[PDB]
Amino acid sequence: MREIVHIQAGQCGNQIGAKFWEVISDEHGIDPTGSYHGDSDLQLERINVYYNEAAGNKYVPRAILVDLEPGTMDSVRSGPFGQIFRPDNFVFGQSGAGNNWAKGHYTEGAELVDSVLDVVRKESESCDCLQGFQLTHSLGGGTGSGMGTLLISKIREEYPDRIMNTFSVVPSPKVSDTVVEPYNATLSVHQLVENTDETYCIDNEALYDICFRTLKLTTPTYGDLNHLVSATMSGVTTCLRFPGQLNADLRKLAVNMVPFPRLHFFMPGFAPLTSRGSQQYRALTVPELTQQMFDAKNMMAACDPRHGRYLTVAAVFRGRMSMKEVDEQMLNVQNKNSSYFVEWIPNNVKTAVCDIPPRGLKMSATFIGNSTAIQELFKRISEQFTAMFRRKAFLHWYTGEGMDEMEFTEAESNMNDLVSEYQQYQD
């Protein structure tokens, strides 16, 4: 009954993935050994969405861990919750991809990928009715980006009627940690455009801003950043995992949020978010959550929503709440902020409510916005790509892996077209 198959590719993908798994096990009352020690029958009712049931009262994540480096795998296995994963679901190379999309997509990744495919087929067979796939990774490196994209293509070929979801961490120029990021992102974005049904645009810069400005966190770590992402991920699939008053799964969300096939790049947000000191001076109420969610400072993509228009927003609420209140608050936001919403899609807001709140909170919210302002993110990337590509800088490495210049030209064109399309509907 509606199983989701999880895939983690490259370092970032793996690490965020681990965080996701940790949170989800806690949520469903699963301990580090795979045993259920929860309180409520609701925690086990839909456990099969994310876990396979093994012999002797144990649950195992329907998760595939992929990397061209074994170090990441080791790190995962040695982590808290590392032992919950199926040993046969770790699919690792020995060499690494050296921040080269071509190595990940055509060379080392190519050699690797068949094992992964074999694993995932088995994982699909195990599930009674697989609704689809969730891939966590980055676009700026070699494995997550090149290998990940390749894997996606393969998956879609075999499961063309299943939902294909990605949580893609994009490279920003402020927090620019690598040199060839523009290339890797460009190449991967293109592929994503044709083969994913929904893509959550996660930005490290935005995460840092959230941590520093909103959470008041003097020294955020990648772990802290990852936590935010994990929360968002959990939010989307709450309707699949628990009961509720109005329920929307991955498909229902896509259908309401994607009016044209290409426009499936979301700016996610999560609410509430408070400092430890500033927690006592707040109101645990729906109007507050709503206020938080639509704010530009709470979006996990480095784009100003006020620089574009919202095509659609999907809001997913968790906790015991008044439907009327939710409906009023959502109508108010669209009436007051009329100019930030496209006028040819009346009721730009879709609402879903799950009765089970996350741990520690009485209410929570997850926001998925399809904004034409996401073009900003792509534009910067394009610019950076151009800057390098004009002089053919670092191209030789990629060509050594069998790549041609023409592919670069194609990818760039494709991305530009995508950008244009977004602009068109923005008006």
């Binding site: 004009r390 210049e405 064109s413 530009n416």
Partner: protein
Amino acid sequence: GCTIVKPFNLSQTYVPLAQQVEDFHKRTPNR
């Protein structure tokens, strides 16, 4: 519309035994 490249003009197998051995075991056959 699209990028145009003007490039400046510049001046223009073994395997380890241990590795091989390892491959002999941990290499998956086609099957």
